[PDB]
Structure formats: C-alpha cells, structure tokens
Amino acid sequence: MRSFLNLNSIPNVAAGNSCSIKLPIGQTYEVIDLRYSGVTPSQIKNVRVELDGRLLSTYKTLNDLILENTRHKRKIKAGVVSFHFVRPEMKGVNVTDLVQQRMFALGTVGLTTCEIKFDIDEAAAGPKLSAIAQKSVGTAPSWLTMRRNFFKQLNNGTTEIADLPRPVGYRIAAIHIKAAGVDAVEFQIDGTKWRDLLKKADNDYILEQYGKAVLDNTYTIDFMLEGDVYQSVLLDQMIQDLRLKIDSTMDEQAEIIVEYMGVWSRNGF
C-alpha cells in the first residue's frame, strides 16, 4: 500500500526568495507533485535535487521538468508539475515492468538530508507553492536518474563534443541538445558509430515511433526508446572516446542535457 501525503508547508515562498522542499527521511518517494500559482515554471530557477548536500539532478528552470514529462507523454496539467522518480516508461527484460519502473524511486534510507532547492524569480507575481508526496516503503537511494547540465558553443557547420563526463559504472539514458539550428547529429563510442549522422526529421520520427514527443529546438538521443535500461550507454572504464558530432546551421550556445543513471553513492557522481 502506498501513502499519499500533503507535504509540510514550503517556508518563505516569495518573489526573489530562495526556497527548499526538505523531504523527511525514512521512506521512498516515487512521485512529488508540486502545485504552483502566481508564478511561471520559467520563474522557478535553479532547481536542484540534493541528497546529503550533494547534487543529484539539476533543472535550469521548472519548465525543463515540464518538458521532461511532456517528452515521455506523461500527464501534464497547468498549475502542477510532478517529479517522476519512478520511471513509468520502463520495461523489464528479466524482471517485471513494475520492478524496472519502481527501481528509480527516490529511497531515503541511510540519508541525512533530502532536499529540492530552487530560486523564485523577482518578477514573480504572487508565488504560491505546495507539494504532495506519493511514497512507499523505505529503500536506499540506490539506482537513481541524475540529470546533468552542460553548455557548449555550437557552430554553423560541424561541432564535436567529446568532453562529456564519463562516471565509471554509470549509464546514459539520453542526451538532449537544446539548440535551434541543429540539422543532424552522430553519436559514436571508440570509433563505433552507434548513431549514424541522422537528420533531425529522421531522428524525430524514430522518437515519435516509440510514443515520445519531440521537444522544440531540441535534438534528443534516446538510448532507452524501448524502455529497456540495458539499451542505455554503459560508461565502461575502458571507453576511450565518447563523441557527439553535431551538424548545425546556426552559431549559438547549446544547453546539453545528459540523463545519467547509476547507484547513488555519497562520494560518487
């Protein structure tokens, strides 16, 4: 049996304020529903999920969480944005789908602090935020999704990005290139071309082919289209080159979103 709780009131919710959603340790958080009003998702900046003071996932703005859910075609409702720790799209290969989905839940056992920090923009009309938690029996943080942010200059022609962090033992579920002039992209590991120079139209077709929604000004490289976790990139310690070849038509600054995965460690990634 699951428990649906109305989380404690969020302290000091005001424009230009730096608030935090401190989660009580002991149980497992499958989903966290954040209700907002008097403020836009884009006005909720620097969203950081921290476990024991360490960063787990980061969102430039709350709007990126809305887009994250939209991509998987999850239920979207105005005035509310959810933190899906449990991945509903997961499919089991040697275990049940339910086990593969729940495995991403945010367990808090052994933790000292679990927080969701963020800053409220100064322009916020009259910010009002509350949270509801869909919890289950306590478990260690264990297997978690680690959303990381990266910024890189994209040229008009060809750009290559090979300096992406490769935490050992971790995996990569997907890579999102946020740019308006990306025509095609190619992904390779150690010379091996796992993703040919696929045109945007072709890449976006495959994405939609798997029930995903294409995000505006984004080139998504989904390594878990089938929902199988073992299709994602396994960051082996021996990998010598993890490269991305981007064919752009514009000279701009791209925000590269990398969805990492791995067993949470107090002194790990």
**Site residues for other proteins per CB under 8 A:** 1, 3, 5, 11, 22-27, 52-53, 92-96, 98-100, 102-103, 108, 112-113, 115, 135-139, 142-143, 169, 171, 188-194, 196, 229-231, 234-241, 263, 266-267
3-state secondary structure of 19: strand
Contacted entry of Ca ion, other proteins, its own copies, none for residue 14, CB cut-off 5 to 8 Å set by kind:
its own copies
What does the alpha-carbon distance between residue 115 and residue 98 come to, in Å, rounded to a whole number? 26
Rounded CA Rg of the chain: 19
Binding positions for Ca ion, 143-172, rule CB under 5 A: 143
Of 209 and 216, CB closest to its own copies: 209
Q: Please count the residues of this chain forming the interface with its own copies, following the rule CB under 8 A.
A: 74
Residue partners of 106: CB distance under 8 A and separation at least 6: 28, 29, 30, 85, 114, 141, 144
Contacted entry of other proteins, Ca ion, its own copies, none for residue 115, CB cut-off 5 to 8 Å set by kind:
other proteins
Q: Are 146 and 259 in contact (CB under 8 A)?
A: yes
Q: If binding is defined by CB under 5 A, does position 142 make contact with Ca ion?
A: yes
**Which ranges constitute the DSSP H helices of 91-147?**
97-102
3-state secondary structure of 77: strand
Contacted entry of its own copies, Ca ion, other proteins, none for residue 171, CB cut-off 5 to 8 Å set by kind:
other proteins
Binding positions for its own copies, 225-254, rule CB under 8 A: 225-228, 231-234, 241, 253
Contacted entry of Ca ion, its own copies, other proteins, none for residue 126, CB cut-off 5 to 8 Å set by kind:
none
- Least gap, CB of 78 to other proteins (angstroms): 28
* Burial tier of 159 (Cβ tally within 10 Å: 0-12, 13-18, 19+): buried
Residue partners of 267: CB distance under 8 A and separation at least 6: none
- Least gap, CB of 134 to Ca ion (angstroms): 14
- Least gap, CB of 47 to Ca ion (angstroms): 19
Q: If binding is defined by CB under 8 A, does position 126 make contact with its own copies?
A: no
* Burial tier of 255 (Cβ tally within 10 Å: 0-12, 13-18, 19+): middle
Among 99, 123, 137, 239, binds its own copies (CB under 8 A): 99
Q: If binding is defined by CB under 8 A, does position 183 make contact with its own copies?
A: no
Of 144 and 179, CB closest to Ca ion: 144
3-state secondary structure of 64: helix
**CA distance between the termini of the chain:** 32
Q: If binding is defined by CB under 8 A, does position 151 make contact with its own copies?
A: yes
Using CB under 5 A as the criterion, which residues of the chain lie in contact with Ca ion when the complex forms?
Answer: 105, 107, 142-143
